[PDB]
Design a protein around this ligand. Sequence first.
Ligand SMILES: Nc1nc2c(ncn2[C@@H]2O[C@H](COP(=O)(O)OP(=O)(O)NP(=O)(O)O)[C@@H](O)[C@H]2O)c(=O)[nH]1
Ligand SMILES: [Mg+2]
Lengths: 379, 170
Amino acid sequence: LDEYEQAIKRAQENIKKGEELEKKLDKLERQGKDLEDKYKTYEENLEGFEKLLTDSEELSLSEINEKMEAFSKDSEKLTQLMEKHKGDEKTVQSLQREHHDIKAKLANLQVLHDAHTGKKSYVNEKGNPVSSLKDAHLAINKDQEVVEHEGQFYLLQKGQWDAIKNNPAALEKAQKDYSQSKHDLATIKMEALIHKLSLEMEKQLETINNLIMSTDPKENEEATKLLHKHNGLNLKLANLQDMLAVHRKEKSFFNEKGEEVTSLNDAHYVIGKDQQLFNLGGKFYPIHKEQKILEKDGKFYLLKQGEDWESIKDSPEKQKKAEHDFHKLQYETPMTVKKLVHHNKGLETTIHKERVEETKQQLEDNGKEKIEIANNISK
Amino acid sequence: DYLFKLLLIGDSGVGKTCVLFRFSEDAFNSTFISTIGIDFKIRTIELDGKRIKLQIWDTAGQERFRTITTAYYRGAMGIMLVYDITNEKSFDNIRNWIRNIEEHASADVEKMILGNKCDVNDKRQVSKERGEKLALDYGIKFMETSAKANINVENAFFTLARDIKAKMDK
Ligand SMILES: Nc1nc2c(ncn2[C@@H]2O[C@H](COP(=O)(O)OP(=O)(O)NP(=O)(O)O)[C@@H](O)[C@H]2O)c(=O)[nH]1
Ligand SMILES: [Mg+2]
């Protein structure tokens, strides 16, 4: 009948779901091995990080010049915009900031360049010439030297030691100059690492593309293996940005217990210089140092630390502002890169099995379902 | 058969990984799993009796993860710029995303703006009109989406594909 049409197509339905479901049930055996390789590649890169700040191959002179060329074509294009919005002071100021940073990026690359032409020389901790940046503590030039009065180091214009060792003021600005120079070199190193890692990552792009196009499924799956490596390098870049930011006192490292800490290795969190880690029963939120979070009647409020319920209890729009302010926190990731990766790993591992079973049932049901539409049609 | 490469960009938290997963697997997960770097999904749709394979690329929203994001602009045919209607900053930042693209992606790339999480009017901070105003200032299509409720997600991708097939057919 009508019914026969609606019964055959009531099993046309069921074999549509015997197949797009059995698709998922080995395609997940799939994705979990993917998940396995992904976190393995990630952890390798993370473990290999410290052992890369010291042992990475340097930027070639060619790479240095090429990255300086690129920055210059950015400083050029920056001024063009600066003189397009001439008069709009608040964007001209914005672009001046962007232009100043590039300028400083370039002064750093120039040090690297000057050392391949030296021009400048690398020097250890402290005084003596070295050949490799990994060994360098300072980069100085031809009319400067490092003297080591006791366990205390000094950076001065060459020869002028005698005009110095009897004036403490000048003993001081030269033990200061020394420090500032060690600092600047550290900055240069992190940026160099970042540039080096960037170049390496950009190169993998052509490759990844090919493996994707490749009709051979064996090659296709190899693009995913390679993406993991690509992203592993990105984990390293992220650490460096975080380090640079802390190094520049834009940010702060904190350990598991929200104690401020100096080094990445001890850090579980990384947040703004003017922020704190606020606890909401077993979870840290990055907020301003002079803010707090108040809970009342299952509601949450971000307020100045002065404020409390009384401050806003008669103001409705205050309350809603403090709730939107709190709501913006929700997807903040104050965690350190390594920590985030471990966090994400637990979340994905959990959810994978929560898709192992649900789909397994979804197949069990669709074969139970088979015993009904086979039943009806054989009538 | 055509083959378009699509790029999702936008601040962390706005829902890029989620609209991707709704369009590609028709699934949504509330659990925040922040994106560490690029990956892609694949979906073949049908426009004008012709197959269109969509190769769709997710990116990392967190600043520390976007050092080389401009390098991904290469050979993107379309770019969805995503923000969160319940987060004004994420919306303000679209200006910068847009600029960054003008400077680093071909002037030819197709661009759609998506105000995601439109299923959360109880926490809205950006008016749908501010949305379309912005999109009109820049001359790019616009649309409010929800990856949770599956609102306008097929829509957004079909439209963007359309505008590429258009320009490409001719
Ligand atoms: N209510 C609602 N929640 C959503 C929607 N889209 C995403 N979310 C939620 O918002 C969070 C952020 O989603 P996600 O896709 O990870 O955003 P993202 O842009 O990928 N972040 P990142 O750049 O850091 O990877 C997740 O908790 C997700 O469940 C939506 O349309 N509605
Ligand atoms: Mg994402």
